[PDB]
Amino acid sequence: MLEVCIIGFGFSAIPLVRELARTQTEFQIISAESGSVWDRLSESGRLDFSLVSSFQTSFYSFDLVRDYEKDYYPTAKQFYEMHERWRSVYEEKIIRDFVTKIENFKDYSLISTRSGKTYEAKHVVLATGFDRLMNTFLSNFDNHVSNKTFVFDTMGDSANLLIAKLIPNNNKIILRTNGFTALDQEVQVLGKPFTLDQLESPNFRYVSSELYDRLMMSPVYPRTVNPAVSYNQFPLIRRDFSWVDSKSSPPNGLIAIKYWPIDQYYYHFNDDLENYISKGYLLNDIAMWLHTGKVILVPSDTPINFDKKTITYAGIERSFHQYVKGDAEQPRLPTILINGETPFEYLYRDTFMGVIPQRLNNIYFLGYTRPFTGGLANITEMQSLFIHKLITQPQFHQKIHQNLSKRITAYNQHYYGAAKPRKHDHTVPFGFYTEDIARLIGIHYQPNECRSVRDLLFYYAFPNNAFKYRLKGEYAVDGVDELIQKVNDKHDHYAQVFVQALSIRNMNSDEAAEWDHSARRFSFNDMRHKEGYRAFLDTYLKAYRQVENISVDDTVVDEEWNFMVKEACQVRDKVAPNISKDEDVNKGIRLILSILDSDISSLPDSEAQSIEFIRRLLQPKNYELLFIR
Ligand SMILES: Cc1cc2nc3c(=O)[nH]c(=O)nc-3n(C[C@H](O)[C@H](O)[C@H](O)COP(=O)(O)OP(=O)(O)OC[C@H]3O[C@@H](n4cnc5c(N)ncnc54)[C@H](O)[C@@H]3O)c2cc1C
Ligand SMILES: N[C@@H](Cc1c[nH]c2ccccc12)C(=O)O
Ligand SMILES: N[C@@H](Cc1c[nH]c2ccccc12)C(=O)O
């Protein structure tokens, strides 16, 4: 009898397959001849973009340990190359077929294929990823079309990449949307580049919900009146968050597009522009697009004729070439039949940690949890660890399964509360999720075990990447020591985010919102760092056009667009003329680095009550997670 069958092999399954190989667990992989989007994009020559996620969070520990030199955004091409290197390694263990049905019994599953070949397997893992409506538009849709109007119903990562591609052909972009959360993927900290995932210091939630909330949420909730911020200049991007019913912020089910803000894009790519473009570094600055009106927000309920092929705004019946409905995201699950008979119904909440469904035996889900920020690698590597422990250690299997139902309920209570299931429940803060799995598995760190300020910096402020939890213990990966050192030396041991936590420990929600936006460039959607980049934008469009062999007359005038652009940018034109963090952080960092190797418990009483606070980081009050305990 087959111990393990892995169904679906592209990206999510690699870390698990590695662990099974390490334990010499008998396993087979079944995966489609036809492959993924990535195979689609590759053969159509459309691996011409870059990830919205840091290298650190997007490639697995056992790669980063070899190839991490600096932070950078890997290209689509490089991401694919990495799937293909690991496919090549495990190809012998892969059967090229398509699974059509799984009949789940008491301690095994019957797997049916399109070939008609049948497979029996004790443990069955699904890693089939998602069908995505939008894949066609990246797959196939023409990036040679010009001067047309697109209407997008939802903003997501795919809409932003497509928009990135449509702007340089004077395509006009209307978002008829119920708001969206966009976040500069890269941020200046005293003028040094940090990917937004470097600045989340998630374990600060253990100090309190309240503190972690003002640490994180002012760029997402509309809490500041600072007129430099995109959600005051353009209030249409504001969202209905009344669905959030949890103390854990940012909440499960919050999604965001991560994007190049043009200043960081400039800093990175100005000196070899066309070369950088043609590798796949595309400017996708939604904030810049709104500033310059190459995109407009219109109200959600703006009238629209799909027959007449027009939308009514600015008292204009505007014709449009295409309405893009936006990215529905469906797990690619084959039919799963319970004890031979009853259809299993997938619902992320009805599953433990996105991984363990309730009425099935020895079936695990790998790749169906979405990280709020950073790459899937964080989620998928930790899930692979969790699934490997469940499959090979019956003690672990039993401990987790005994009370699976109460674990799921306690998880859903903590993270979702009374909220009805939403289609984005699969989305989680990466540094909560990785930490969650690490405490489940037992490869977590103990706050109580920090000795130096340095240890407190590593515990609280070093990002909860998967490889953080592979330094020591059951899932240790050689080279993680040197990776963490490298990463720590390059980022000042993450003292700047640690000092942010110090700085707002005593503020209320509104004080922290104001403080976060007092900076000369606050982290996300700072509209003061846009005008000065109009010239560069034209160089960029010229450069994009020369890489993709495009011709466009920039003198054509769409006076309806301009009336529309003017109608849309009314609040902005009112609010933009009305236009501490850098100082506090600057001092905080000087202080922390001065006591790096200073012993914690030892530190002296009443540089004020901030030491009292640093000392209480050994005994955080919000450490309980009832779906673990
Ligand atoms: C356009 C795009 C951009 C993305 N950008 C990023 C990014 O910047 N950063 C990031 O971290 N993530 C990104 N992702 C998300 C994620 O990294 C990819 O979706 C990744 O492909 C998911 O890996 P997977 O292994 O879960 O699924 P896939 O890579 O889709 O692989 C699953 C495999 O299983 C096969 N399969 C499915 N059903 C069956 C079946 N019944 N039987 C047999 N085989 C089956 C499929 O053919 C496929 O080859 C992006 C996704 C897309 C679509
Ligand atoms: N702590 C950083 C980074 C940050 C804030 N909110 C975020 C949301 C998502 C990711 C990163 C962040 C800041 O306050 O600016
Ligand atoms: N799901 C990706 C983000 C992403 C980028 N491009 C996409 C297109 C479609 C769906 C998701 C995406 C992640 O986990 O980081």
Which CATH number fits the domain that encloses residue 46? 3.50.50.60
Distance CA 187, CA 1 (A): 52
Within 10 angstroms of residue 316's Cβ, the number of other Cβ atoms is 15
Nearest to 353 by CA among 411, 406, 399: 411
- As a whole number of angstroms, the distance between CA 171 and CA 165 comes to 9
Q: How far is the CA of 426 from the centre of ligand 2 (A)?
A: 21
DSSP state of 198: G
Please report whether residue 493 resides in a domain.
no
Would the annotation count 38 as a binding residue? yes
Residue 20 located in a structural domain: yes
User: Which of 289, 280, 296 shows the shortest CA–CA distance to 261?
Assistant: 289
Q: Whose CA is nearest to atom 12 of ligand 3?
A: 157
The ligand 1 site (C-beta within 6 Å) comprises 7-13, 30-32, 34-38, 51-53, 58, 98-99, 127-129, 132, 135, 138, 158, 332, 334, 367, 375-376
What is the CA(196)–ligand 2 centre distance, in A?
A: 6
Q: Are residues 139 and 126 in the same domain?
A: no
Residue 581 within any structural domain of the chain: no
> Exposed, middle or buried by CB within 10 Å (0-12, 13-18, 19+), for 496?
buried
Residues 281 and 357 in one domain: no
55 annotated to bind ligand: no
Coil vs helix vs strand at 228: coil
What six digits make up the tokens of 182? Answer: 């966009």
196 close to ligand 2 (CB < 6 Angstrom): yes
Residue where one domain finishes, among candidates 387, 416, 439: 439
Domain boundary among 439, 471, 495: 439
Q: Which token pair is 111?
A: 């797997």
Residues 314 and 347 in one domain: no
Are 505 and 211 within 8 A, CB to CB?
A: yes
Kindly give the number of the ligand 1 atom that is closest to the alpha carbon of 58.
Answer: 11
Interhelix angle 376-392/14-22, nearest 10 degrees: 30
Query: How many Cα neighbours within 13 Å face the side chain of 279?
Result: 14
Q: Residue 11 annotated as binding?
A: yes
d(CA 131, CA 137): 13
Residues 435 and 550 in one domain: no
The answer on 128 and 140 residing in a single domain is no
Which strands sit side by side in the sheet containing 310-313, from one edge to the other? 304-305, 310-313, 316-319
Among 380, 408, 439, the domain-final residue is 439
Between the CA of 597 and the centroid of ligand 2 the distance, in Å, is 27
298 with 352, same domain?
Answer: no
168 lines ligand 2 (CB under 6 A): no
Q: At what angle do helices 394-402 and 376-392 cross, to 10 degrees?
A: 110
Q: Pick the atom of ligand 2 nearest to 250's CA.
A: 8
Helices marked H in 140-196: 157-166
Cα separation values, 386 from 352, 436, 599, Å = 11, 10, 34
Q: Whose CA is nearest to atom 1 of ligand 2?
A: 199
Cα–Cα distance for residue pair 449/387, rounded to 1 Å: 27
**Same domain, residue pair 273 and 385:** no
Ligand 3 centre distance from Cα of residue 27 (Å): 29
Question: CB–CB of 367/380 below 8 Å?
Answer: yes
CA pair distance 438, 426, nearest whole angstrom: 18
Same domain, 268 and 154: yes
Domain that holds residue 50: 2-132+329-439
- CATH code of 291's domain: 3.50.50
C-alpha 129 to ligand 1 mean position (Å): 5
Q: Is 375 in the pocket of ligand 3 (CB under 6 A)?
A: yes
Chain-centroid distance of CA 173 in Å reads 24
> How many domains is the chain built from?
2
In a domain, residue 585? The reply is no
Ligand nearest to the CA of 119: 1
CA dihedral 419, 422, 426, 428 (to 10 degrees): -50
Q: What 3-state DSSP class applies to 30?
A: strand
Q: Is the dihedral of CA 311, 313, 317, 321 positive or negative?
A: negative
Burial 531-566 (b: 16+ CB within 10 A, else e): eebeebbeebbebbbebeeeeeeeeeeeebbeebbe
Q: Are residues 61 and 125 in the same domain?
A: yes
Distance (Å, rounded) from C-alpha 437 to C-alpha 353? 8
φ, ψ for residue 123, nearest 5 deg: -110, 130
Q: Establish if 483 belongs to a structural domain.
A: no
Residue carrying structure tokens 């300020």: 453
Let me know the angle formed at the C-alpha of 499 by 494 and 503, rounded to the nearest 5 degrees. Answer: 155
**Cα–Cα distance between 266 and 496 in angstroms, integer?**
23
- 407: annotated binding-site residue? no
Q: Is there a domain that residue 223 lies in?
A: no
335 belongs to a structural domain: yes
Residues 435 and 350 in one domain: yes
Residue 402 burial by Cβ neighbours in a 10 Å radius (0-12, 13-18, 19+)? exposed
- Nearest listed ligand to the Cα of residue 139: 1
Which ligand has the shortest distance to the CA of 130?
1
Atom of ligand 3 nearest to the CA of 51: 5
Give distance in angstroms: CA of 248 to centre of ligand 2: 15
Instruction: Give dist(CA 161, CA 262) in Å, integer.
Output: 15
Do 155 and 118 sit in the same domain of this protein?
no
The tokens for 614 are 């640093």
Which atom, in ligand 3's list, is nearest to the CA of 374?
Answer: 15
| Helix axes 509-516 and 495-504, enclosed angle (nearest 10) | 140
481 labelled ligand-binding = yes
Cα–Cα distance measured from residue 446 to residue 461, given in angstroms and rounded to the nearest whole number: 14
161 CA closest ligand 1 atom index: 1
Distance 327 CA to ligand 1 centre (A): 15
Atom of ligand 2 nearest to the CA of 524: 15
Same domain flag for 67 and 171: no
Beta pairing class for 356-357 and 363-365: unpaired
Ligand 2 atom with minimal separation from the 217 CA: 6
Say if 208 falls within a structural domain.
Answer: no
**Ligand 1 center to 24 CA (angstroms):** 26
In the structure encoding, which two tokens stand for residue 487, read together?
């990463």
CA of 505 to the centre of ligand 2 (A): 16
Q: Please tell me if the CB atom of residue 370 comes closer than 6 angstroms to any atom of ligand 3.
A: yes
